[PDB]
Amino acid sequence: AAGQGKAIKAIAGYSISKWEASSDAITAKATNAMSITLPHELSSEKNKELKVGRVLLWLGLLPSVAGRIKACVAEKQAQAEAAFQVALAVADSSKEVVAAMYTDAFRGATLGDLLNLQIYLYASEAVPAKAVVVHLEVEHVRPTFDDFFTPVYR
Amino acid sequence: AAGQGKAIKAIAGYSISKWEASSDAITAKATNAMSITLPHELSSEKNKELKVGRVLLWLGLLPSVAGRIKACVAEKQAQAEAAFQVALAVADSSKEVVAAMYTDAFRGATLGDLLNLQIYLYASEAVPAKAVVVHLEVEHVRPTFDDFFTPVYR
Amino acid sequence: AAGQGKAIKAIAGYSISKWEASSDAITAKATNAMSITLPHELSSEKNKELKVGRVLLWLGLLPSVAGRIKACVAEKQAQAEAAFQVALAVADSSKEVVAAMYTDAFRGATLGDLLNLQIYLYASEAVPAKAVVVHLEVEHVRPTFDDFFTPVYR
Amino acid sequence: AAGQGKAIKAIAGYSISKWEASSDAITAKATNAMSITLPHELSSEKNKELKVGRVLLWLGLLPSVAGRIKACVAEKQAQAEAAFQVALAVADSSKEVVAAMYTDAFRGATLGDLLNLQIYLYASEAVPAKAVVVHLEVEHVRPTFDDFFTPVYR
Amino acid sequence: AAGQGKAIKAIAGYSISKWEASSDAITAKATNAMSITLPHELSSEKNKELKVGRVLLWLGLLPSVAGRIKACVAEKQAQAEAAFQVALAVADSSKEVVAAMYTDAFRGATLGDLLNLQIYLYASEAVPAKAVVVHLEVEHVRPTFDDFFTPVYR
Amino acid sequence: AAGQGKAIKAIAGYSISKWEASSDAITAKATNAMSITLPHELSSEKNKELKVGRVLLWLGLLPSVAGRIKACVAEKQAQAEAAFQVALAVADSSKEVVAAMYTDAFRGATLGDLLNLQIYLYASEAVPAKAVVVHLEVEHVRPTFDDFFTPVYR
Amino acid sequence: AAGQGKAIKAIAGYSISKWEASSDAITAKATNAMSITLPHELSSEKNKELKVGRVLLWLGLLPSVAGRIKACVAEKQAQAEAAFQVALAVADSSKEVVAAMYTDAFRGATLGDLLNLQIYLYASEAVPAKAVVVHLEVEHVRPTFDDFFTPVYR
Amino acid sequence: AAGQGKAIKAIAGYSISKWEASSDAITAKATNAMSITLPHELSSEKNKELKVGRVLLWLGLLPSVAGRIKACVAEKQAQAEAAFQVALAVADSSKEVVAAMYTDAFRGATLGDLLNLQIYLYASEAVPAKAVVVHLEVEHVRPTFDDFFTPVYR
Amino acid sequence: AAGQGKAIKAIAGYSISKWEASSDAITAKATNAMSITLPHELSSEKNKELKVGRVLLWLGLLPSVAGRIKACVAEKQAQAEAAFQVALAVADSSKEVVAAMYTDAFRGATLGDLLNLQIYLYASEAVPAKAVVVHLEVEHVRPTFDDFFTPVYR
Amino acid sequence: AAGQGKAIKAIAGYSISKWEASSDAITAKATNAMSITLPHELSSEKNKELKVGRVLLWLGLLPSVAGRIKACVAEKQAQAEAAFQVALAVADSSKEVVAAMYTDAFRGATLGDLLNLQIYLYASEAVPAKAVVVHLEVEHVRPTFDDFFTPVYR
Amino acid sequence: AAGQGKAIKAIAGYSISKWEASSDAITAKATNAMSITLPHELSSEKNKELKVGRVLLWLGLLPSVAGRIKACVAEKQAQAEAAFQVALAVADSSKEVVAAMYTDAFRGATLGDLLNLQIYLYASEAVPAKAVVVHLEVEHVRPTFDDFFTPVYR
Amino acid sequence: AAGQGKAIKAIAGYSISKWEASSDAITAKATNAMSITLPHELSSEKNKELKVGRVLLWLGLLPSVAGRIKACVAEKQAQAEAAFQVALAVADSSKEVVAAMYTDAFRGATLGDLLNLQIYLYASEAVPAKAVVVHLEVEHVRPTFDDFFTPVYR
Amino acid sequence: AAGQGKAIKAIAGYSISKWEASSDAITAKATNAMSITLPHELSSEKNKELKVGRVLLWLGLLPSVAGRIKACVAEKQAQAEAAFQVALAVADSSKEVVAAMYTDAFRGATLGDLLNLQIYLYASEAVPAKAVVVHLEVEHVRPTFDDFFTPVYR
């Protein structure tokens, strides 16, 4: 009566940018480490400084993909494997809900800082490239738009 | 509080149309792609323009049906398999709740647009035809009725 | 805990009648179809017309019963198997909650109509008779009692 | 008033259960002593403890039944005849109103206690069996009904 | 200290229809069983569904008629004699008041149901035909009347 | 009108003491004269001075007791027979109600005075001893109870 | 106190029943154990359920009675002697005040429970029978009296 | 104000009459029984009807008087000795306070009734006559005084 | 509070004069009779007329003094011994409190009248002279002081 | 939200008593039936009558314990196995939450009644003794505590 | 002492725990020294820290126990005998009230501290074991109860 | 409470200092005279001038100490024995309460003055040294405490 | 009106300290028992006394770690294995949520007490060291900070 019929809503002043990234082939027990790339509209300097709120990560797999997939967002790791030991949430294909909701892990940071983070992706068995799409949804402060025309009328 | 003895209610002004569709045989690891067909009462032009709200999809399987079934609603795909990587919800027979609730995926669209969508249905093992019934429940704006007689008495 | 602590309560004017029914042996993949029998107190004509609200169905199995059990309430079916494809709820022993709550499936009907319904019971493996007790709980309008003595004193 | 076109009503919270018992042949001047048997619905332990209010007893005789019939409710008697000397009310076929209304004789007792009471029936002349039906009407606290389903939903 | 110059009045919304039926010869100790026949104005379908309230039955006998007459209204009986053992009221010529007021026996039923009832009439001695008139007074919901003319000025 | 299901209630400040007395054999047309004996609890001096209100007397006879019985309460009589000519009320077995309600005959007197009264009992035919129980119900001022402990702790 | 001229008063709604019991001969150092017997007026079922408040016990001895007497109220004991070790109060003839006031020992219990209690009586020297009177005063809820006459008037 | 040097005061409308009585010789273990004699001023008929409240009794002994003295006020006894077993208070020379305060024993009685009472006096050893003075103090309704002269002026 | 850690206080307008008197030898069972001597300051005529309130008398004995001592204040007696039978209070060395508080015995009298009273002192055994000090404390109206100088300055 | 960072709280007036019981060895597919034992503090008569509310049962197993364990609370069963078919809740080690919350199954009963209940424990494989601890938590009316000392001080 | 009819009541927030301890044989003039043992319910760590208020100690002796018994509570003594010289209260069988009320001796301390105290018990004559029961009543802060179930539902 | 569960409290502004003194051997009938010694904290000049209120003195004796002990506080006496004849209170071991409360004897005096007083102690029989502890409790004006630091900062 | 987008928040006045601990190799079916170490900032005396609220424990494992891991917090155990039978919560890698939330297990305790607790960690298969990171999060009263400089300026 407030969850399965309604979606989770952004806070006042923020909006949600969503984008994806396709996986690269991954060998059994391996852990690839792709990086975050902001969508063009958010790459400006003015935007790369917008403050982040919550971050959600979920996975889209081909029905065929067998095995177990796990993924998460954490800072660059000396050892990929280890990301999963410190990540504050993990999207795991074997659970009921295959998603990772970072409630405060990056709250306060800003887009751009997200560029220094990484998405670690593990698979228990070999998985073809493009077989896993990683969806990322970032709640951040709503960007500002231009309110004035260039002043050409002297 | 402590209980789910009430179903999710339609929003003010909307009602929920429910209908089903029987599956066609499906071979192991295959992904059939049946299409949405509005119920006759909703096929009129006046109706095919009623705005959609939420859309629920669930599966009815024969108890015997072994294996894993997955289904979802998405736009026509170049590759059937791929639908599951972008669908915003998936009904999966291996989960506790085998249903897919599209909260906003089609909100704003109108019936008829639903005609351009598809229902992708995957099975990990061979499945006889008619062994899976796909239930579809669309919350849409309530159609209008005639409140006036033909003007005969001049 | 915080998961609940309270049971689901009947609506105003209604009460809940509960009764059970023991299973008959059932062979692997089979689907028996026992029928609903109102409790004596509800068999009168006056009562068989009391309106139904919600209906709950749950299973009580012997610890030993191995395999998977599924059950449901639906109208007489040409094919037993098929009941599970149209039933609005299914009690399934493999889930966390092995119960089926029919929120509106029979709301409005009346006891007695329940007599034309059936309880389909499936088992993935052979199961001895009496190994499964099917509990049925019907929320219906509360029956009336006499408020007057026979007018004897003239 | 101007007359009784209204029956006597049960006090608040109580209802009236009515049932009968057929007589056994009875010889002139004799006094049979049949016993009270609660109706099945009231035989449960939960019910056998419902408090009693007023109790009414009346007789239904074949038109042909000649002679005088008297009946009453009292505790088991050493001497049947004697019941009529202590009973607080007696139904007598020779009176205008052939009924016995025990206003307080059993008020406070509970159903079940009624099981330890007896119905003494006298006849001045020989009377065939089944020729007299003894109607008993008991005003008692209304039994309670279940308001909650079984807590299933976790 | 009240009064006895006032008859019992029908409740709001109801009215009282009265009619009679003449007896057929009746032999000593016998019990004839004539049946209820609604008055023509009440035989329509619209009316045969009007709800009943109270029902009064009284007897009109020739001064000469000796012996004892009893009468009552009850459902069709296997044994005529037995009606008097279950009837909730009996008109008996030997009492001060020779009438039977069914306060609730048929409350709720409807006219027409009255057609399935019977009037049992007993006499302790032989009685010529037409020597007893059985008056019947039924309080029922007031029938509705037409408030509109046929719409012709169109 | 309803209320024929209520007993006559004692006035404010008073309560009703009830007790009985068994008859002694009585020969045809004779008139025995037993006397009033207060119940032990009322024999104290403090109590024998409680003021009386109404007094009720009724009879309990063996069903068999044939003939006519009459009884009443009056002051000691020179001639037993005569009591019935001055008694303000008489219990008579031939009437509808076999009781005598002295509304004011002893109002104002006190218990104890009742000791100087007598119960005259007449029978039209011979009657065995113990065949008639005379019930006596006296409404009197409610006796006072002790409100203090003995003063020992001083 | 403010001087000592007032007795201890019963609480609202309660009254005090007082009664005594005579002793049986008692040998030196012996401990007799007589039992509590409610006064007739309190032996009814209605009364044996009246709640107790405080209980007082004091002794009345012949002036001649030499030696020391002790008494008390406690539950049936395996060993008479031992009663005095657990009794919450003891009446002792050698003290200034020879009484035992049980303030809460039996508060809440009901008359009748008092029947399961005992009065232990010890004497340091031989004492004739009847030489000691044991007074008992029980504060209990004020018993109820009949407020209705037997309904003889229909 | 506050204190410990205040005597116990008579209730409103009452006053306290005090008087004494000298003892008669008394032999060891014996129990004399002198009687109450109202003071002359209280012997009038008008006064012998004044209601009593509390009664106090104390003893005045010669310093020499050895042994133990006990006294009390109770109704005439069959056995002198026995008075002490029922008296509600006893003045005993061996106690700290040699007095007996009858708080309610005679409350309600009237002077004169006091004439039917007795003062039992026991001594453990032989005691000369006049060696014990028995003081008696009675709180009673204040006798009324004449407020009118004789109507001499007609 | 008032009689615990606080002494009993003189009433308004009064004060308490305290003084003592030494005893004269006293032989076993004897009763000396010393007399009251006002303190010099109270011997004036003006003072000897001050009204008395309460009077307290207590004894001070040598630790060694064995036996029992009794004392009191009463009017001159024909027989010393007898004082103790009429004195309204007695100071007794065998009691808890060895004092005599005359609450009203001399209330109203005046100092000087005290000169006509006597202090009777009894001893059960021989007692040396000066071995008992009799303390006397009289509450009386406070004497008046001079508020004016001699009108010498004109 | 209030999430599961808060435990389920007892209703006003009640408190929760928790205690455990160690298992006895159990053979494959067997079903032991240990019984409930109230904790000492609750064994008193005063307590064995405290009303129960909700009851929770959960299991504590050794990490090593392999197989499936099920447990429940029900009345003594003819057949242990059968308890699981009628129990209103079952703690099952294979579920997410291994507990059984009886919301109303024993509401209204009292402690002590719990003594007539049993804990049935089943295991799919052999399990050593003490390998399973059964925790029981009973919500019941809070026991009352003494607020008064023994009335020692006179 | 102070108030009769009423027991001394606990201060707001505290309650009274009562328990006993049986004596061990004791030889003439000897002084045993048993120790305090908290009742199980109070042995928990949470409880052993509940603050104490007043403490009462009284004795229960067999009627036969001759001689004088004294008892008290004090800290462990080098010399048992000496306890009685410093204890702030002593229960003495020779006094009117055989009890010891420690008003402030242990106020502020906590249960548990009571464990470091001792109960010294003296007897002037030889006394069998178990012949003296020492009752101990401690007023302490009211212990707190569990208001939550174990958080099992996560 | 009742006044038996509360100690006597010091007056506003005052506090109570308590201390003891051990006795020196004392021969039969002798009277030792130990002197008062203020506790160190009270020996300062500032304190020796604090005003006294009430003074309490009680005795702590060895259980064995036989005989009679008496004690008191008075000014230095020419004759020890004599102190008891003028002391305003005496602690006497033979009384119920072995204490001496000087309500006004030293009120107004100051500590230090107490140094000029003496404690006289008498014994009827020989008593070892240290066998009697004399407790002294003095209510006096509460000593004042410094509210300022030394003015060091100049 | 949303769902799981919020984190459980600390109560007013408290904050949450989080820290971790790396595991040591662990052999199949073994149960290591590491101990709690407060973070430096919390090791001060001032802090080790800050009260605890809720405690959360969760595990971070290498994706590769196969087998089942269980962990929990409990007091030092005689038998490691046994911790899991009494811990009020267990983090289990096989469940949906691998965490243990101690809602009240340590509420009230203080940091430092946590030092006497242990973290038991079990594994069904051999696990390398450092392969499991145990996260511990403690909600405790917020520590205070210094608000003043050292008073160096005189």
Short mmCIF file of C-alpha atoms in Angstrom, two decimals, chain G:
data_model
loop_
_atom_site.label_atom_id
_atom_site.label_comp_id
_atom_site.label_asym_id
_atom_site.label_seq_id
_atom_site.Cartn_x
_atom_site.Cartn_y
_atom_site.Cartn_z
CA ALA G 1 -5.67 7.73 65.85
CA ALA G 2 -7.01 11.12 67.08
CA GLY G 3 -7.83 9.69 70.53
CA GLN G 4 -9.33 6.18 70.12
CA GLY G 5 -13.15 6.32 70.15
CA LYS G 6 -13.93 4.95 66.71
CA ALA G 7 -14.02 1.42 65.31
CA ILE G 8 -12.47 0.38 62.01
CA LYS G 9 -15.00 0.87 59.20
CA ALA G 10 -15.71 -1.44 56.24
CA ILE G 11 -14.94 -0.14 52.74
CA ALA G 12 -17.57 1.08 50.30
CA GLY G 13 -19.84 -1.72 49.10
CA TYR G 14 -18.74 -4.16 51.76
CA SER G 15 -20.26 -5.16 55.05
CA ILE G 16 -19.04 -7.32 57.93
CA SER G 17 -20.30 -10.77 58.82
CA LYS G 18 -19.41 -11.94 62.30
CA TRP G 19 -19.76 -15.38 63.81
CA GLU G 20 -18.11 -17.65 66.32
CA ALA G 21 -17.02 -21.19 67.01
CA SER G 22 -16.43 -22.91 70.34
CA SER G 23 -13.21 -24.79 71.05
CA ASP G 24 -12.72 -28.46 71.79
CA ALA G 25 -10.67 -29.54 74.78
CA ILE G 26 -6.97 -29.01 74.16
CA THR G 27 -3.98 -30.63 75.86
CA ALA G 28 -0.79 -28.83 76.93
CA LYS G 29 1.44 -27.71 74.04
CA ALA G 30 -1.12 -29.18 71.62
CA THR G 31 -2.50 -27.43 68.52
CA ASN G 32 -6.12 -28.17 67.51
CA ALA G 33 -7.27 -27.26 64.03
CA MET G 34 -10.98 -26.42 63.71
CA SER G 35 -12.36 -25.35 60.34
CA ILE G 36 -14.30 -22.37 59.02
CA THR G 37 -18.06 -22.76 58.53
CA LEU G 38 -19.96 -20.01 56.75
CA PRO G 39 -23.22 -18.85 58.36
CA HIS G 40 -26.27 -20.27 56.65
CA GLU G 41 -27.24 -16.98 54.92
CA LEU G 42 -23.87 -17.03 53.15
CA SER G 43 -23.93 -20.71 52.08
CA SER G 44 -25.86 -20.09 48.85
CA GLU G 45 -23.98 -20.33 45.56
CA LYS G 46 -24.71 -16.70 44.76
CA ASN G 47 -23.01 -15.72 48.03
CA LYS G 48 -20.10 -18.16 48.21
CA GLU G 49 -18.70 -16.03 45.40
CA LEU G 50 -18.73 -12.70 47.17
CA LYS G 51 -15.22 -11.21 47.34
CA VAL G 52 -13.42 -10.87 50.68
CA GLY G 53 -11.60 -7.81 52.00
CA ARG G 54 -10.14 -7.85 55.52
CA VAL G 55 -10.57 -10.58 58.13
CA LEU G 56 -10.37 -10.21 61.89
CA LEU G 57 -10.02 -12.93 64.48
CA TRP G 58 -10.11 -12.51 68.25
CA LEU G 59 -10.52 -14.72 71.28
CA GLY G 60 -13.02 -14.87 74.11
CA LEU G 61 -11.70 -16.82 77.10
CA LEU G 62 -13.08 -17.77 80.50
CA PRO G 63 -11.42 -15.59 83.17
CA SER G 64 -10.12 -18.77 84.76
CA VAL G 65 -8.34 -20.09 81.60
CA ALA G 66 -4.70 -20.00 82.68
CA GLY G 67 -1.74 -20.46 80.40
CA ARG G 68 -1.11 -18.95 77.00
CA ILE G 69 -3.44 -19.24 74.01
CA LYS G 70 -2.52 -18.48 70.38
CA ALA G 71 -4.67 -18.72 67.30
CA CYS G 72 -4.55 -17.94 63.62
CA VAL G 73 -5.96 -18.51 60.18
CA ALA G 74 -4.01 -20.25 57.47
CA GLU G 75 -4.38 -22.86 54.76
CA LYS G 76 -4.56 -26.55 55.66
CA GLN G 77 -1.23 -27.55 57.12
CA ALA G 78 0.76 -30.74 56.97
CA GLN G 79 1.84 -29.88 60.50
CA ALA G 80 -0.54 -27.90 62.74
CA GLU G 81 2.32 -26.41 64.75
CA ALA G 82 3.77 -24.89 61.57
CA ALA G 83 0.75 -22.72 60.83
CA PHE G 84 2.08 -20.13 63.23
CA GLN G 85 5.30 -19.80 61.25
CA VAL G 86 3.61 -18.63 58.12
CA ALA G 87 0.41 -17.01 59.36
CA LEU G 88 0.51 -13.30 58.60
CA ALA G 89 -1.01 -12.51 62.00
CA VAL G 90 -1.53 -14.25 65.31
CA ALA G 91 -3.98 -13.73 68.17
CA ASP G 92 -1.95 -14.22 71.32
CA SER G 93 -3.45 -14.01 74.83
CA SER G 94 -0.21 -12.75 76.36
CA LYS G 95 -0.23 -9.53 74.29
CA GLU G 96 -2.05 -6.23 75.02
CA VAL G 97 -4.32 -6.82 72.05
CA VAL G 98 -5.41 -10.43 71.66
CA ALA G 99 -6.45 -10.26 68.02
CA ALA G 100 -5.26 -11.01 64.49
CA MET G 101 -6.10 -8.60 61.71
CA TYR G 102 -5.48 -10.08 58.26
CA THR G 103 -5.24 -6.99 56.13
CA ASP G 104 -4.48 -8.60 52.80
CA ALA G 105 -3.98 -12.28 53.51
CA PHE G 106 -7.40 -13.13 52.00
CA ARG G 107 -8.26 -9.94 50.16
CA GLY G 108 -9.48 -10.98 46.73
CA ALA G 109 -10.46 -14.53 47.73
CA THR G 110 -14.12 -15.25 48.16
CA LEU G 111 -16.29 -16.70 50.88
CA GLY G 112 -16.22 -20.44 50.42
CA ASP G 113 -12.46 -20.25 49.82
CA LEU G 114 -12.61 -19.56 53.52
CA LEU G 115 -13.97 -23.11 53.78
CA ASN G 116 -10.58 -24.42 52.68
CA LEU G 117 -8.87 -22.49 55.45
CA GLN G 118 -8.45 -23.52 59.04
CA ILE G 119 -8.21 -21.99 62.45
CA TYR G 120 -5.24 -23.28 64.38
CA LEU G 121 -5.54 -23.00 68.14
CA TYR G 122 -2.64 -23.65 70.55
CA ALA G 123 -2.54 -23.73 74.35
CA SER G 124 0.49 -23.94 76.62
CA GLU G 125 -1.55 -25.80 79.24
CA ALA G 126 -4.53 -28.11 79.31
CA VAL G 127 -7.79 -26.35 78.49
CA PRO G 128 -11.37 -27.68 78.93
CA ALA G 129 -13.69 -27.80 75.92
CA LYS G 130 -15.82 -24.71 75.24
CA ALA G 131 -13.33 -22.67 77.31
CA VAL G 132 -12.34 -20.64 74.26
CA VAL G 133 -14.60 -18.94 71.80
CA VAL G 134 -13.08 -18.00 68.49
CA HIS G 135 -14.67 -14.90 66.96
CA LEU G 136 -14.29 -14.38 63.26
CA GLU G 137 -15.24 -11.23 61.40
CA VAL G 138 -15.15 -11.14 57.65
CA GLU G 139 -15.47 -8.01 55.54
CA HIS G 140 -16.93 -9.02 52.16
CA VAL G 141 -18.85 -7.59 49.25
CA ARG G 142 -22.43 -6.89 50.32
CA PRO G 143 -24.68 -9.84 49.15
CA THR G 144 -27.57 -9.24 46.74
CA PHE G 145 -31.27 -9.57 47.59
CA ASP G 146 -34.22 -10.54 45.38
CA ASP G 147 -35.89 -7.54 43.77
CA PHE G 148 -38.60 -9.35 41.94
CA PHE G 149 -41.70 -11.23 42.96
CA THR G 150 -42.28 -14.60 41.40
CA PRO G 151 -44.01 -13.75 38.11
CA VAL G 152 -47.42 -15.21 38.84
CA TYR G 153 -49.49 -12.64 37.04
CA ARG G 154 -48.58 -13.77 33.48
#
